C-alpha cells in the first residue's frame, strides 16, 4: 500500500587544508581549517514489493559535477546492478560556497579550482556512496507526507530590476520577487516515528562570504544541523538516525544577505541596475547579512529556515501516495531547437560567458572592476579575449545577443572542453510529487515557469494536482538559467546563462517532454541522447615537530577558567590536515569530566558549529593546529578539556596517527 523508505547521512568532507574553497571563484580563498563537516544525505523510496526505486541525494557541496555523477553512477552499478541507474538517481548540491574545490573535469572549473584533487574527489564519492548504502540497508515500511509554508525575512532578490523585465501579467500573479514557499517532505515508519525529512527552499548559501577560510555548509547546512540535533537527542553532530536535508531550489537570484546592497564607503543604497556606487564603483556595492559577523548571519538565516521547517514537519497532514516513476535524457544543449511560436523557432548556443560574469554579485564582487548589466563589449577586453583564447565566430556572437562574450567556452577545448555540451535532464515522481533535476541555478521566475509548465503537462495527460519542485545544481553544472526577458539586462546570472537567451525555453520544452513520457507511460520511447565523455586527465612535505617535542603536544593551553560566552583556545603542534584524508571523523573533541563516573564525555566535535579548527603552516614542516571552543551561553559549568586528532607524514611514504590532549580547564558560574 505505502512506500518502503530508507535514509542515510555520511561524511563527504574533502581536505580542509592546502586547497581552495569552491564557489566565489576568489583567488586567495584557500581552506585553513573546518567550521563544520559536509554530509551527503540520501533518500531511497521503493514500491511495496521493492521495485521501481528512486534515489534523491542532497550533498553539502557547491555544485554536482559531470565527473562526480559519472563516477558515482559507475560504482552504483558495480555494487547494485540495475537497482540504481542514471534515470532514478538525482545528485543535488546544496550550493554551499565553503566546500573544497577540485572535483570537476571541464576546464573552466579546473582553472577556478586551480587543479584537480583526487583525495577530495574520492572522499566525496565514497561519502555519497556511504549515504546511499546506509539508506539501502535500512529501508522500512512507512508513509510520506508533504507540507508547504512561507519563510519570511531570510531572502532578497539580488537582481530585482532584471526580474522587472518579466511580463507584468506574469509578475502580477505573484506576491514577491523571491519564492518564499518552503516545501517539507516528511517521512515516518508505520509506527509513526520519524525517519527523515527533505526541505526544498530557494536561497544562496553564501552567508559565509569570500573572506572565509573555514569549511562549512553555510545557512542551509546549519538548518539541517539544527533539525538533526533536535530530533537526535543525545547524539553528537553528524550522528543519529534521523536525517534532515535541505535541498537547493531555484536560488539563481536569491540572496540571504537581507540588509540589501549598500556602498561600503557611504552606507548608501546601491540597489540599482548596475549594482554600483558613485564613488569606488562595483567593488563598493555589497550586501551584508543580519548578524554581527558572517558566522552570526549564517546562523540567523539558518535558524529561521530551521524554525519553519520544524513547524511544517510537525503539522504535516497531507499524505503522498501513488506510483514511483522516473525519466532521464542526455541533451546537446548547444543545438536545441526551441519553439517560441507555432510558426517561429530559435536555437540554443555553444556555451559562452558574458562580460558581467566577471562582475560577480552583491554576495561576492569581482576584482576586475566589471559591472553587471553589460550589453556591450569594449575593444580592450575583446582584444585580450581574441589574443589569448581566440576570436569568437560570428555565429556564436549573434546567437548570444545581446550578451557580449567574455569567454566563448563552447569553442575552447584545449586541453579539454571548457564547458559541457551534454547535459542531464530528468524528473523523478513520488506519487503527486515531481522533482525536476535542474543542472544549474534557475532564477526565481525561471523556476516558476518550468514548475507550472511541467505541472500543466502532467495535468494534460491524466496526472492531476502535481506538486513540482525545482532541484538545483543537479548532475552537472551549467551555471545560471534566466528568463528571456531577464537575459536582456545581462546582469551576472544572465551573463552566466551559457546556452544563450533561449536556454530556459529549451529546458521547459525538454522537461515538459519528460513529464509527458512519464504520464503516458512511454519513457522507453525517449531517445537516450548523446553519451557524455569521461576525461582521464604541491610538492610532498614531511611534517616536523619542534625540537624536544612531538605531534599533539600543547604549545598554548586554555585559560584556567572561562565564563560562558567566551572562547577557549588551545594550540597544538600539528601536521598537515590533508594527511588525515578513513576513520578520521573529527579533528577535535571538546570533552566534559563527569565526577560521579570519573570519566570524560565528548560534548563537541569538529562538526559542532560551536567549535573551530584552524591550521597554520610554518617553516620546513612545522605547523600549528588551533582548536577554538566558542562556549555557548547554554553550556553547563564544569571541568573541560580539548583534544586534537591528526596525521603526520614521514619518509617509503608513511602516514601515522597521533593525538593531543589539553590540560583540563573549567567553565564557571557567574
Ligand atoms: C565578510 O564578513 C566579515 C564579517 O564577518 C567582514 O569582516 C569585516 O571587514 C571589515 C573590513 O574589512 C571590517 O570593517 C572595518 O575595518 C576597519 C579597517 O580599517 C577596522 O579598523 C574597523 O574596526 C571596521 O570594523 C570589520 O571589522 C570586519 N568584521 C569582522 C567581524 O571581522 C568582511 O569584510 C566581509 N567580506 C566581504 C568581502 O564582504
Ligand atoms: C605555533 O604557536 C606558537 C605559540 O602559540 C607560536 O610561537 C610564537 O612564535 C613567534 C614566532 O614564530 C614568537 O615571536 C612568539 O614569541 C611565540 N609566542 C609564544 C606565546 O610562544 C608559533 O609561531 C606558532 N607557529 C605557527 C607556524 O603558527
Ligand atoms: C585516485 O585515488 C584512487 C583511490 O584513492 C586511486 O585508486 C587512483 O589510482 C588515484 N588516481 C591517481 C591519478 O592518483
Ligand atoms: C510568431 O513570432 C513572430 C515574431 O515576433 C510574431 O510576429 C508573430 O506574431 C508570432 N505568431 C503568433 C501567432 O503570435
Ligand atoms: Ca566545528
Ligand atoms: Zn550561485
Polypeptide structure, described:
Its EC number is 3.5.1.-, 3.5.1.23. GO terms for molecular function: calcium ion binding; N-acylsphingosine amidohydrolase activity; zinc ion binding. Zn(2+) binds at residues 95, 204, 441, 480. Belongs to the neutral ceramidase family. There is one protein chain. This protein has 670 residues and is of the alpha+beta class. The protein has 2 domains: 1-537, no CATH class; 538-670, Immunoglobulin-like, CATH 2.60.40. The protein is 22% helix and 30% strand. The chain is built from 13 helices and 39 strands. Helix 1 (66-80) crosses helix 3 (118-136), helix 6 (218-231) packs across helix 7 and helix 10 (444-460) runs parallel beside helix 13 (503-519). It binds a molecule of 3 linked components (NAG-NAG-BMA), a molecule of 2 linked components (NAG-NAG), 2-acetamido-2-deoxy-beta-D-glucopyranose (2 copies), calcium ion and zinc ion. The site of a molecule of 2 linked components (NAG-NAG) has 8 residues, from strand 30 and strand 36.
Brief summary of the model shown:
It is classed as hydrolase. The chain has 670 residues and is an alpha+beta fold.
List the defining traits of the structure above.
globular; eight-stranded mixed beta sheet; binds calcium ion; 670 residues; 39 strands; Immunoglobulin-like; hydrolase; 2 domains; alpha+beta; binds a molecule of 3 linked components (NAG-NAG-BMA)
Amino acid at each position: 500500500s505505502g512506500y518502503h523508505i530508507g535514509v542515510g547521512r555520511a561524511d563527504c568532507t574533502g581536505q580542509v587544508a592546502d586547497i581552495n574553497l569552491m564557489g566565489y571563484g576568489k583567488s586567495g580563498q584557500n581552506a585553513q581549517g573546518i567550521l563544520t563537516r559536509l554530509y551527503s544525505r540520501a533518500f531511497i523510496m521503493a514500491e511495496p514489493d521493492g521495485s521501481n526505486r528512486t534515489v534523491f541525494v542532497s550533498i553539502d557541496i557547491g555544485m554536482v559535477s559531470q565527473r562526480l555523477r559519472l563516477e558515482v553512477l559507475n560504482r552504483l552499478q558495480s555494487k547494485y546492478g540495475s537497482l540504481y541507474r542514471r534515470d532514478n538517481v538525482i545528485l543535488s548540491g546544496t550550493h554551499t560556497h565553503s566546500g573544497p574545490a577540485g572535483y570537476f573535469q571541464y576546464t573552466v572549473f579546473v582553472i577556478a579550482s586551480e587543479g584537480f584533487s583526487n583525495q577530495t574527489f574520492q572522499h566525496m564519492v565514497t561519502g555519497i556512496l556511504k549515504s546511499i548504502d546506509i539508506a539501502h540497508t535500512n529501508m522500512k515500511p512507512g508513509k510520506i507526507f508533504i507540507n508547504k509554508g512561507n519563510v519570511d525575512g531570510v531572502q532578497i532578490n539580488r537582481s530585482p530590476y532584471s526580474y522587472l523585465q518579466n511580463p507584468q501579467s506574469e509578475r502580477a500573479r505573484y506576491s514577491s520577487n523571491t519564492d518564499k514557499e518552503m516545501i517539507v517532505l516528511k517521512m515516518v515508519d508505520l509506527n509513526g516515528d520519524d525517519l527523515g525529512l527533505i526541505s526544498w527552499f530557494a536561497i544562496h548559501p553564501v552567508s559565509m562570504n569570500n573572506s572565509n577560510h573555514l569549511v562549512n555548509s553555510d545557512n542551509v547546512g546549519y538548518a539541517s544541523y539544527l533539525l538533526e540535533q533536535e530530533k537526535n537527542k543525545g547524539y553528537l553532530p553528524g550522528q543519529g538516525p534521523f536525517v534532515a536535508a535541505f535541498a537547493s531550489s531555484n536560488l539563481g537570484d536569491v540572496s540571504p544577505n537581507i540588509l540589501g546592497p549598500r556602498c561600503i564607503n557611504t552606507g548608501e543604497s546601491c540597489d540599482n541596475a548596475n549594482s554600483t556606487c558613485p564613488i569606488g564603483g562595483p567593488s563598493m556595492c555589497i550586501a551584508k547579512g543580519p548578524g554581527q559577523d558572517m558566522f552570526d548571519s549564517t546562523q540567523i538565516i539558518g535558524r529561521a529556515m530551521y524554525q519553519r521547517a520544524k513547524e511544517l514537519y510537525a503539522s504535516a497532514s497531507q499524505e503522498v501516495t501513488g506510483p514511483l516513476a522516473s525519466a532521464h535524457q542526455w541533451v546537446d544543449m548547444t543545438d536545441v531547437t526551441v519553439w517560441l511560436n507555432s510558426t517561429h523557432a530559435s536555437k540554443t548556443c555553444k556555451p559562452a560567458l558574458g562580460y558581467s560574469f566577471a562582475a560577480g554579485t552583491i554576495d561576492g564582487v569581482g576584482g576586475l572592476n566589471f559591472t553587471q548589466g553589460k550589453t556591450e563589449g569594449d575593444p580592450f577586453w575583446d582584444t585580450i579575449r581574441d589574443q589569448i583564447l581566440g576570436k569568437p565566430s560570428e555565429e556564436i556572437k549573434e546567437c548570444h545577443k545581446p550578451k557580449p562574450i567574455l569567454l566563448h567556452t563552447g569553442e575552447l577545448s584545449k586541453p579539454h572542453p571548457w564547458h559541457p555540451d551534454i547535459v542531464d535532464v530528468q524528473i523523478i515522481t513520488l506519487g503527486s510529487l515531481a522533482i525536476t533535476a535542474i543542472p544549474g541555478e534557475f532564477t526565481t521566475m525561471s523556476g516558476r515557469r518550468l514548475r507550472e509548465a511541467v505541472q500543466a503537462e502532467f495535468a494534460s495527460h491524466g496526472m492531476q494536482n502535481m506538486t513540482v519542485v525545482i532541484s538545483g545544481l543537479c548532475n552537472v553544472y551549467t551555471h545560471y538559467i534566466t528568463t528571456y526577458e531577464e537575459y536582456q539586462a545581462q546582469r551576472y546570472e544572465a551573463a552566466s546563462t551559457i546556452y544563450g537567451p533561449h536556454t530556459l525555453s529549451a529546458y521547459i520544452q525538454l522537461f515538459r517532454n519528460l513529464a509527458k513520457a512519464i504520464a503516458t507511460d512511454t519513457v522507453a520511447n525517449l531517445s537516450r541522447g548523446p553519451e557524455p565523455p569521461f576525461f582521464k586527465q604541491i610538492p610532498s612535505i614531511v611534517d616536523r615537530a619542534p625540537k624536544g617535542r612531538t605531534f599533539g603536544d600543547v604549545l598554548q593551553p586554555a585559560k584556567p577558567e572561562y565564563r560562558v560566552g567566551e572562547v577557549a583556545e588551545v594550540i597544538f603542534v600539528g601536521a598537515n590536515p590533508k594527511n588525515s584524508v578513513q576513520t578520521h571523523q573529527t579533528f577535535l573533541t571538546v570533552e566534559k569530566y563527569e565526577a560521579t563516573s570519573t570519566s570524560w564525555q565528548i560534548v563537541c566535535n569538529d562538526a559542532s558549529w560551536e567549535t573551530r579548527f584552524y591550521w597554520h603552516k610554518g617553516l620546513l614542516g612545522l605547523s600549528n593546529a588551533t582548536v577554538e571552543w566558542h562556549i555557548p551561553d547554554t553550556a553547563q559549568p564544569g571541568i573541560y578539556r580539548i583534544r586534537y586528532f591528526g596525521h603526520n607524514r614521514k619518509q617509503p611514504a608513511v602516514i601515522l596517527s597521533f593525538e593531543g590532549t589539553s590540560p583540563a580547564f573549567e567553565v564557571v558560574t557567574i
